[PDB]
Structures are given as C-alpha cells and as structure tokens.
C-alpha cells in the first residue's frame, strides 16, 4: 500500500 | 489546489487526485476541526471501504484540534460498527475529540508519530435562557462528560476515576506519555 | 433636559430640579432597566430619607421592564432593613424584577394605577465554558430561582407551589388581577 | 473536497463521487440544517430511487440539528408517498426536525447508533407587526405545533398528551431511551 | 453538492445530475425565492419541453416563500402560452407568488401534499421620492393587486369579492382547505 | 442624573449631591467594575476621611462584579494603612475582587445584607507572545494567586489549603454561608 | 462622578472637588496611561505648588501601566527642575514609565504600598516606510533606550550593565524586591 | 478632569482652573497636535496678554508632535507681531511644527528641558485628481517647503543649504544638539 | 490560474497541471504559511512518492514565512519516517518553521539559493483564562521550545546551548551563513 | 474568463488555454504584484522549460508594480541557476522588484516596449515592538538594500555609488533612458 | 455564465465558448476597466493571432470606461509592434484609455457604431508623502500627459496644441464628431 | 450494498 | 496634611 | 528530472 502501516518494497 | 496523480493498471492509465488515490489504498484523513459535514464524509469513506473489502484494515490519519462532539461520535460509532480494524495514527496533534477518535482505534493498531502531541479535556458548551432550560442543557452535557470518560477508560485501560481527574483541565501528553497512558500503543519513529 | 422648579421657603427662594424636588417629599423613581449604578443610587436615597425622618413613609414609583437580579436585591434588602414603610406604586409596567420590588413594598401600601400591567417570570441567565463550571452556575441560578419564589410567596400570600407554576413562563397580570393575586393591595383610579 | 471512487462493471470502469456512489446503493444523507434547497435535493433522490426500483428499501442517514419545518415536511410527505420503505438511521445527533424525520421512517426499520442522541422540542417562530397580524401568525404556528405532535404520537405510539408534555421544553434522549420511547426501533451496536 | 446519476440506454451509459435527470422526465423544480434569474431558467425549461414533446404534461414542483411578482408572471404567462398542461404540486409550502403559480396550473392537475401549507396575501411594495412619483407607483401596485385578484378568482373559481376579502391580510390554508377553496384539486396522500 | 439634597446648618443651607452628602457622613460606595480610575477615587476619599477624623469609622458599601486586581489592591493597602476601621457591607453582590475588599474590612465590622451573594475564584489573565515572555507572565500571575490566597486566609481565618481548594473554580456563597466561612461577620436583616 | 468636599476656613466654608482638595495639600495623582494631555496637567500642578511654597514636599501618587515616553520625560524633567522634593508612592502598580517616575522621586522619599508591584522593560516602538527612514527611527529608539537605562542606574544605584540585563524583557518586582533593587526606599505597611 | 486652585487676593478668594491660573502668570501651553481650533485659542491668549501688559514676557510651553502647517503659521505670525518676547520651552518633545514654533521664540529665550527631543522634517501633503490640479498643489507645497526652510535658517542662524539637507528626511536632535544647532539657546537642567 | 502542460509518452499525450507535473518527478512545493490543510497535503505527497519508488530522492522546495508548529511537525515526522532522502531547497525565504523543515532534510542534500534568507526564533503562543490554565499552557510551549531546540541542534550539529542563545530573538542568516551554521550544506549558485 | 485556443498537430487537435499555449512556446508572464504564490508558479514554469529543452531561450514578460522582495529573489535566483538565457521584456511598467527582474535577464536579451516605464527605489519595510527587535529588523533590511544595490550595479554596469544615489528615492526611467542606464539593452519599436 | 457554441469541421464537431469562438475569427473584446490582468490577456491574444496568421487583420472591440494607463500602453505598444492591422470598433463607449486604444488602431480601419460616445481627458493620479517625493511623482505624470497628447495628435492628425486644449477637461464626442475629429474614420450604421 | 443495513461478505 | 506621608492627629 | 537537483541534457 501507500500509508504508514502498509509495507513498500 | 490538489495535485493529480497517475495510477498504472492493466486496462490503462487512470487520473486520480491525491486524496482519492490514498482512499483506494484504504487511507482516510481527518484534518481540521470536526464538524457535521467533514464527519459525514469520513463515515461515507469507512462504509465504502468496508463494502469493497471487509477483511482489510482501514487507516485513519488524524491531525485535528477537535470540534463538535456529536459530529465526532458519528465517526466513533461507525468505527466500532464496521468489521475492519480502524488503525489510527496521530500526525502533528490530536486534541479533545481527535484524541478520542485516536484512542478509539483498534487495539494494538494505534500509533503516534515521534513528535506528535495529544491533548484531552472535558466537554465545552453553553446556553442562554430560562433557568429551567439551563438545568436541562446543564444535565445533558454532564451526561455527555460521563459517557466520554467511560469510553476513554474502556479504550485506554485506565480507571474511570483516573480519567476524571486528568480531564478536569487541559492535559498535554507527548507521544511517549500517550503510550504509557494507554492512549496509543507504539510510536512510528522510523520505517523498518 | 430636566426642568427646574422653585420652592418658596421662609429663608428665601430655592432652585431645584424636578426629581430632587420630589425627593424632598420622600418620593423615589425606579425607571428603566435595573442595573448596579441606578440601583446604588436608589439605595442612597432610601438611606438618606431614613436619616432625615425615620417615621415618615417613603414612596417608590416603579416603571421598569426589570433587569439584573443582584442589583434589584440590593434595593429589596434596603427596603426591608430601613424603619420607614416603603410604599410602592406601579406606573405603566412593572416586570420581572420591578414586580418583585413592587410586591416587596409595605403591606397595605402597594398600589397599581388602573391601566398598569405586571409581568412575572423565572430568572434568565447563561454560561459558556467547561461542564464543571456549567454545573456550578446552573446550580446557582436554581438557588436564586428558589429564593425569589419563596419571597414572592411571602409577600403575595400565595403558596410556594402556586408561585412556581405561574412563573415557569411569562405571566401578565392586569391591575385588578394583581390585587386578586396578592401582588398589590388596591388601585388608585381617582384622587379622593 | 469530495473523494472520487471507481466502480468495476462489465462494460468498464466508472468514476463516481463518494456521495453519488452510495446513492447508487440507495443511501441518502441528511446532513446539517434543514433548508429548502437541501430538502428539495433529498426529495429528488427519493423520487429517483423509487422509479429505478420501487420494491427495494431506501436508507436515509440523519446527522442534523434541525431547521425549517416546511422544508422538512416536504421530506416527510415524500417518504410516506413513495412505495419503498424509507429506513432511517441516526448518526451523531437528530434534533427537532431531524428527529421527526427519524421517527417518520418505516416501522421496524428505524435505528440509532449506540452513542447518538435525539432531541425534541416544540416549534420556534416569530413575527413583528400589527396585533391583527400577530394573531394570524400565532394561530398558525400553534396549528403546526398540534400537527407535529399528532404525527409524533402516530409514529412513536405514545399518546398525544404524553408528546405534548415532553415537547414543551427541550428533551434529550439517548439511543436506549429513544428505543423505549418508540422514537426508534433498535440499535446498531455491531455488525452481525 | 449535487449527486450524479446514471441512465441506461441502448447506445450506452449516460451521466446526469439529479435535477437534469428529472428534467428529462418533464419535471421542473421551483425552489426558494422567486427572482428574475431563477424564473428565466424555469421559462427556458418549459419552452424546451414543449418543443421536445407538445402533447406530454409538464410537472412543476413548488416549494417557495414567494418573491418578485414580475419574475413570477413570466412563469405564469409561459404556462398559459404553451400547449402542454402544466401540472403543479405543492411540497412544504407555496406562499404569495408560489401559491399563484400553484393555482395557475392546469385544471384538474393541481395537487398538494398532505402536510403542505399555502399562504396568500396582497402585493408588497414601496417607494421613496416626490409625491407625484409616489402617486404613480401607488396607482401601479394597486393595478397589480387588482390583476392578481382577478386571475386568482379565475383559477380558484371564487368571486372577485371573496378573493379581495381573504387577501387583505395573510391567510394560511392547509392542504384540505386549499382543495375546498379551489386553490388545488386533490391531495397525494399515498401512491396507488 | 444625580439628585441634589439640602443640609441644614447653623451658618445656612447647603446644597449637596447625594453621593457627596453621604461622604460627609463617612460612607463610600464601591459600585461596578474595579478599574484604576474609580479605585483612585476611593483612595482619595479614604485618605480625606482619615484626615478629617482619624478615630471615626469609615463605611465602604460594595456592589461590584470585580475587575482589575492591581486597581483593587490599591484600595486594600489603603484600608490597612489608615487608622480608622473600614467597615464593609455587601449589597447585591460582591464578586472576585469585591469579595476580597469585603473580607479585608475591619474584623467584627464586615456585614452582608440578607439576600446578597458572594463569589470567589482565582485570578484571570492572559498573554500573547514568545514562550520566554509567556513564562514570565505565567509565573507572575501565579505569585498573585498565591498572595491573594494568603490574604484571604488571614482575614477569613481559614487555612491556606482550604482557600486554594475552594478558589480553583467559581464558588458562590449566600449571606449565611459567608458568615460561617469567615468572609463576613454578621447579617443586617433589620434595623434595631 | 467626582464627590465634592467642604473645607472649613476662617473666612467661610469652601466647596472643593476631592482631587482639587488634595492638591491644596500638595498631593498629585498619576493615574492611567501616560499621554501628552494628562502629563501636561501634572506639570502644571507641580509648577503651581512650587510657586505657592518652594520648601514643602510634593507627593506624586502613581497607579499607571505606563505609556508614551516623551510624555513621561516631561514629568521627569519637571520633577528634577523644581526645588521641592517630589516624594513618590506606588499604589496598585507602577509599570514601564510609571516605574521610571517612581524611582525618579527624591532619594529617601520613594515608597511602595505593601502589595504593589513594579514592572520594568525596554522601550516599545515601531515604524513603516523606506529602509533609510527605518534606520533613522531605529537608531533613535536605541538612543532612548540607552538614556532610560542610564537614568535608571543613576537613581536605583545599580550599574548600567545590570539595568541592561534586567530590562531586556519584562521583569516584575514585588514591593520588597523593589526596595532591595534600589527602585524604592521603604514600604508603608501601617501608619505610625 | 482639571483641578481647581485658589488664589489669595486683597478683595477675596478666587477659584481658578489650573490652566487659567497659569495664564494669569503669562504662561501658555501648546499640547498635542496642531489644529485650527487649538491654534486659534493660543492666538487669543497671546493677544490678550499683550493687551494686559505689552512689556512682560509671554511663555509658551511646547509638547507636541506637530500637525497642520497653516494652523501653526497663525501662531508664528502672532508671536512675531506682538511686542512681548515669546519665550519658548520644549517639554517632552517638539516635532515638525512644534519645533518651528520652538525656534521661532525670542532670541536668547528659547529653552529645552534636559531630556527633551526635537524632530524636524519637510512638509507632508497629498492630492488626488487631474494632473493639472496635481501640478498646482505640488507647486504650492514646494513653496511652503521653501518658506519654512528660509524661516528655519533665519532663526537658527544656519544657512539655507544646511537646513535643506537636514530636513530632507526626519532628523532627531537631543537637547544638547538643539543648542549647538541654533534651534534653542540653553537648557534648564536645574533651578538656580 | 495554473498553466497546463503536456507530457509525451508511448501510450499518448497526457495533460497535466504544472504542480502535478513536477510531482511526477518527485518535487514538492511548500509555499506560504504552514497550516493543517496544506501540511496534510504535503504528507500525502510524500507517502505517495515513497510507495511509487522508495529508493529515489524526494525534493521539497521551501518558500514560507512559517506558521503553526503542530502542522509543521507532521511534515517533519513524515520526512524522517519514510525511506527516501528528502532533499530540501530554500527559495526566497525559509523562516521559523520553514527553517526547521529545511534543516530537517537529509544530510548532505540541503541547499540554499544564493540570495535566499533564513530566519530562526523561538515559538510564539498565548492564552487567556485562569492562572491554573495559564500555567499549563505556559509549561507546554516551553516543552515545545526545548524540543525544537534539541532537534535544531541534532541536524545543525551545533550545541544545545548555542541554539538557545541564537533563538532567544529573531536571527537572520544569509545563504553563506546558513552553510557555516550547519543549517544547510551548500549553495546552488549555477547549474553545472 | 480565459479564452481557449486550438493547436493543430499530427496526432490531432488539442485544446489549450491561452496562457498554457504560450508556455508551450517558452513564454512566461509576470503580472501584478509579486507574492509568494505567483512567484512559486513562475519558478515551476522555468524549471519545467529547462527540462524540456535546456538550450532554447525562455521569455519572461513583465507588467508589475513590484511586491515582496523574498518572493522576487526566488525568481531571480532561478533565472541565474538554469542554463537557458531568460530574456526579459517590459510591457506597461516594471517597478521596484519588476525592474530588478527585468535587468536580471540575460545580457543582450533585455527589452522595453517603446512607451513602457521603469521605476526603481529602495526597499520598503517596517516593524513594531521592542527596541532590541527594531535594531534586528532595521539591520536586516539595510543588508537587503545593500545586496539589491550590488546586484543592480552588476547587471546595469553602473557603479555601486551611482545606484545608491539614484535609488534613495523613486526614480522613473522611460524606455530610452533605461537603455542608456544599462537597465535594458534595446527597444522593440516595430517587428522586422 | 457563458454560452457554448458548436463549430462544424471536417474532422468533427467542436465545442467552444462564445468568446473563444470569436477569437478563432480574429476578434478580441476589450470590456470594462483597463487593468494589468485583463490587458495582459489581450496582449496574449494579439501575439497568438499574429503567429497564426500575420497577414490577416485583427479586430479589437472596445466598450470600456478606461482605467490604468500603464496597463493600456501595454496594449498600445503591442498593436504597433505586430504586423497585422488592428482594426478598432467602439461599442457603447470608449473613454479615456479606451479612446486612446480606439484611435491607436490602423488608419482607415477605426470605426464607431452610430450611437456610441467617446470621452477624452488628461491623466488622473495622486500621491501622499514628502514634498520631495511629490515633486517626483508630479513631474512623472506630467511627462505621461505630454506623451499621451503627442500620440493622440499623431493618430488623430490634429495639432499638439489642439489636443492640449481639448483634454484639459472632460470632452464628449458623439460618433459623427469623432469622425470629424480624426479619432475614428467612419461609422458602421448598417451592413452592406 | 454499502450501507449499514445492507449486508457485506 | 491629608496624604500618606503627611501626619494626622 | 525537472527539479534543481535532477540533471538535464
């Protein structure tokens, strides 16, 4: 996802 | 002005505004004073995200000095009704009603950024008229004060007597103190 | 402008304003809204007339739509303290606090002109702030309401339950009905 | 700003605003003060949803402090005219006219969120002019008061005498008390 | 904000605003005060619907407290000119000019919702200047008053003398009384 | 307007205003809000009466909702400096600073009329500017609060801890409760 | 209103206002903000009292939050010019310019009432215009600041470096601290 | 308020206001902004004192930020016309026109108090209208500027070129610098 | 108005606004006063660019006179949370909070244009109310001042004692001095 | 309103607004007062045109009475940073900051239309507060004045002493005089 | 609101606003007061039409009461620069600057509608400040007045002395008189 | 549906 | 006298 | 890119 909690590669 | 972003999909390119883009990823912003119109918009977003997927968490980002209580309780009751766990994050500040919606998030999924600040107090109100009407509106706001302290105690884990003592006047809590107070769960210092 | 009058005495002629002339004959005017400054002036007149002669009646002419309560209770407590009997007369109208000072006059010496009108209601007030402060000011104005109804019952002769029912909302009383209600004693239709 | 959402269909993707998206699922929002323009918009939505499908329930979400009566009775009369059952839900608050539109919903399909609050009172009004005109407008608002109490009694199940006593002054009802009072039917505490 | 709706057609899907959607079904809304700009818009809608189909009825939904007369007579004269029968419905209220446009509808096709209310009075006006100019503008508004009473009598069926007596001051008519008075024809209590 | 009175003396008649007449008998009025100009006038009266006769009591009649503190402490320090015993009487009301000047009167010579009411709270203030300046003005008003509580305890006889608890918020005292609290000594119900 | 007093003399009775009465005994009041008109009045009083008797002390009673500097320096320069020793007393408060006129009194004859408070800071000012003019007015107010600190050091006995450090921001001094700081000489707690 | 003073004479006692008392001793005050009405009052005082005694000096005490030029030149031309020598003294400040009236005093009889301050600049003005009118009013104020610089040079002793350079912008002069600049003659530090 | 630009891509031409075009190249603008709404927009842009690519630098262009602190700390905490290095550039000016967000950029990637100017001071605030509340809000803004000085010292490399001395009052830093002070790293004089 | 234009391309027709059309041909407009928001927009256009083609000249058309300096220096520093030569043209007028951005253009590519007019002066500013703060802001605007004169001398070719003398007050330059002064290079009388 | 029109082309239908449609046919409207923003828009249209076709005439339709001069000279200088002949037409009125842009059109292609009216006067302006600055701005507007009269003489064919006499005050010219005066060339009474 | 009353999977 | 400093009997 | 830091041909 995009948010703080969501993980990004 | 609000910037426009582009999302790449299999069907084709798609133009979004930045706030609507983040809504697609289950992120809601609670900004500014809490009023009936902005709150009725946040309710519409939560209900929509529940229908789109009821098993994925919703994120509510809070930067607000508070506002009307009845507008805020519409947000609170929606968060407890829907099946998804509404994670809450405090950015900048979360004051009187913003703090109540912060602590009302799902247990274990309430956060504060490292330099944010939380403020809690008792309800503000007022009336002008006959003494019989003053008694009615005075009794009502006291019932609201009692209800808001019970729910604060339920979510923070503190006792009702502790919440009453601390909310008699304005009380500021840094992000570490909010964790120790049960108002939030942890701090998002860095990304890991 | 206020006209000047002349009084003939043995020593010589004397120039007076019309309101000060009538004060020499033990007549006081309660005009307009009841505030701290005008009420503090009426107290000074009553105390002065008591000292000049404590056995002669004082006359208080009332044409007022009422006003602040605390300003009016300074007039009431003075009227009961001093030895002279404060006769009250209603000209034009005597509303909420003006009616309380009307009925507070000496028993048997309270009058209404034939077309005057009396109005009674409960105290008006208001506050804005925290719920804890709203409870304090709400309890206070209720104590004032209870105290004003007890004194209304004492002077009118009615029961406390009757005064409470009639003052829950505005109640207008003509000059005959004020006599029947115990609020005043008689009517000065003509001079005899 | 109002976020935009995307609906996936067989023909292709479709861009909607969030309020228009929920209208597609037969959901109407009554937010803020009740006036002629917003009410004329709610009527247009109800009539449109009746035509699209007359056998599917319409949902009216209420968060309002009330407003003009004549604007609200246009919403009420439409709800009773159309064949679909207009389910009503109270979010945050439903005051004087909002409470009348809440209880006017279809029987068995009126709800209150667990922390919402309902307020009921009698009509407010006023006029300035000749005494002959004051009598006309005073008689009219009393007829309105009588009509609003009859309809409140019809939908709540209470007696006309009970509605008259309770609406003489402001009366706040919590969500449980609204159920006991017949104003609503049940509470949506959680989703099951 | 105005919601957007979708109409399904053979060619494809079509996005409409809710007010433009109902215009496609020959429904016009007269909301708020009657002024030159809103009235010039209603005229444009009536003329357009006549051209699209001159044999299908037009519906004019009225919720208005009235306004300028000259703006309203542009609507009236258009309704009488065009071939289609302009059915009128009263929602909420139809006051001074709104009531004149209500009764001006096609005979047999004028309706009132069960709790709507109609008000009729004589024209309001005013002028400031020389006496010679006051005579001119005073004579004019009297001619307008005479013309409005003649047309009220024509459509209601009452006599000119009855309309003059009833419109000397404000007169409120419930929906049943409007039927008995000839102002409207029937009531749309429920759909059958 | 202020009435004029006449005093009979051996030399001849003498014209006085009513407030100046009572000053001749050692009576001072403290009316309205406490400000620098009215307070500087009360100081001038006290100093003058001390010089005219230092062994005769001065009377200070209080009907005030309070005001500036620094203006009131000029009255307090003068009352303690001068040799005459400053008797204080409460008429109508004596709030925050008026209550402090009431209790500051000579011991045994402080009175309340039977329906007067006393209110006490902590100082009000405020500042806008840099944080370094906010600390300075915040420390100062706390020192003032501490000084006002010590002097309240000295004159009332209560403990400093009791005064601190009672003045954290507004506290109303009837005339009997003021006697029990040490704020005043007795009540002037009637003249004997 | 200002009360009138009577002075008994050999020639006869004499009517005075209270402020003019105290001027006869060489007492001047400095009340409220310091402006050109009130200051030009204080100068006229000092010059008059010097002429009437140049060997008797003048008393200047100060209760002021300060004001314009140039208006205050007219008072200061007069006090130093005239032969009589200008005794100064602080009642309530003596802020920025009032404190400078307090300490400017004759050495050994400067007093503070026991609960008075003194405040000192640096000059306030401002300008809007070209940069060349801003430099001129900025240099000027700095020269004023330097001159006011030198004179403060001369009368208080402190060093110029100490006055500069303490007046960079607002500094409140109680009546005991003012004595220790050299700003005043003693305290008039009671009369002996 | 203005205090009243008493003058002892052979005929009897005499009541004066403080400003009228000093006028009896040939002292005039120029306070505040220079306008037509205050200046026309100063002219009346100078003419009166010339008639009462044409051989005794007049004293003009100046504390002014300046004002209208044409109002000030009425004072200047009067000072030069009358036979008595008009001594000028600067108290607090003497700005643009006040400085011109200061230096316009009699040679050798112009003084500054030790902490006073003088300011000089060029005339201020303005106009709005056609270019032909702007040229007229622009030429006029330049002639005024030239005339004011010539008279400044005459009385100060400086050259016209020096006055032009120094008055192009605001220039502040302390009391010593005013002596060195020829604007005043000496300083009244103390009385001898 | 905002100009529209065209981007050439393989799929086809694409219309963008100029601010949204630069966002596609990872450039964010911080313009004007810092408030809750504009800051909540900058947070949304940073989070979006992190998701699109977490290894590419984000650029934040600053031209702001500062504003609310709590709104700015939401931007600061986001910049430290996200993985990409937020490069900061100062254009025109970067005052109190804009300077804090400037120095908060990634080390080695903070720049100032050659004629830009930086200003730093301590927090501004204020409150009006009871002394107990003034102590609470005064303690809070001092904690904020301490926290802002610690973070300024962390990023600038200076000591906490140096930051405290320099921020007691307004301090302007040119672009070279900002480099020497550790506030920024280098200057973008020309492109190479 | 802004007209829309059509551009013919190989792919198809394209709709542009007139200002965005000219931006496609590397033309920027600087209109009205210079503020932070309009200036931040001009920076975005210059950066975009550099990226699209860094070897083609940018044109900046100026018709402005000037404004904020810090907003203008963001435009100046950008013009010097980017590789393309920013040609400047004066239309109508180019005053204080507009003239600085005019002369800041690329050497040999600065133009004035035949009847345009240029005005130059020194910075305007102002402050209100303590003398210590007035010194800080006064020193700063003098540094700005010095920096603006150095850059004016660099681009115009004049000496720093000449720029200082000419900018002490407003100085208007016609289009020929601007060429002779080095402010611009030539005049675009006609197209050749 | 602005109506939308449709243009039929070979490629397909095209939607235009009415003002943009006429721009496609080389028609520009100069409406209302002349300011910097509207004038900068007219310049953009003229430059665009020159580029699209430099050999086809541009038409400028004028209905304006004039405005700022510097904004108008940007339009004038553009009209003379570009190769196409700018035909001017007066509709309704063309006052001070609108008349200058009317006569500035291409010779032989300046027209007036039969009932239009032209007004010419001298520049209006104003300033407030020091006399040295008044001289600067007064000299400037006189140079502008001289320049505007020379250009009026060039285009009208009259002598400079005649233009000066006629423009000293407002002078109205009907459409025939404008032809005789050289201000326009002919009249478009009817289409042939 | 989406609303409160409507059921979601 | 009357003032603070002045003495009274 | 387009910005200051980004390089352009």
Numbering used by the authors:
A (entry chain O), L (entry chain P), M (entry chain Y), N (entry chain U): 267 to 275
B (entry chain A), C (entry chain H), D (entry chain B), E (entry chain C), F (entry chain I), G (entry chain J), ...: 2 to 193
Question: What's written in the study?
Answer:
In the ClpXP protease, for example, AAA+ ClpX ring hexamers bind target proteins, unfold them, and translocate the unfolded polypeptide through an axial channel and into the peptidase chamber of ClpP, which consists of two heptameric rings (Wang et al., 1997; Grimaud et al., 1998; Ortega et al., 2000; Ortega et al., 2002; Sauer and Baker, 2011). ClpX subunits consist of a family specific N-terminal domain, which is dispensable for degradation of ssrA-tagged proteins, and large and small AAA+ domains, which contain sequence motifs that mediate ATP binding and hydrolysis, ClpP binding, and substrate recognition (Baker and Sauer, 2012). We describe here near atomic-resolution single-particle cryo-EM structures of single-chain ClpX pseudohexamers bound to ClpP and protein substrates.
As single-particle data processing with C2 symmetry produced maps with conformational heterogeneity, we used signal-subtraction methods to allow independent classification and refinement of ClpX∆N or ClpP density. Our D7-symmetric map included ClpP14 and symmetric interface contacts with ClpX∆N. In both heptameric ClpP rings, the N-terminal residues of each subunit formed a collar of β-hairpins creating a pore into the degradation chamber. ClpX IGF loops, named for an Ile268-Gly269-Phe270 sequence, are critical for ClpP binding and were responsible for most contacts in our structures. These interactions included packing of the Ile268, Phe270, and Val274 side chains into pockets at interfaces between ClpP subunits. Asymmetric ClpX-ClpP docking relies on conformational adjustments in the N- and C-terminal residues of individual IGF loops, allowing the central portion of each IGF loop to contact the flat ClpP ring despite projecting from a spiral. In our structures, the side chain of Arg192 in ClpP appeared to hydrogen bond to the backbone of the IGF loop. By contrast, our results support the opposite conclusion, as the ~30 Å diameter and overall structure of the ClpP pore in our E. coli ClpXP structures were extremely similar to the crystal structure of ADEP-activated E. coli ClpP, with an overall RMSDs of 0.8 Å for all Cα's in a single ClpP ring and 0.6 Å for all Cα's of the seven N-terminal β-hairpins and adjacent α-helices that define the pore diameter.
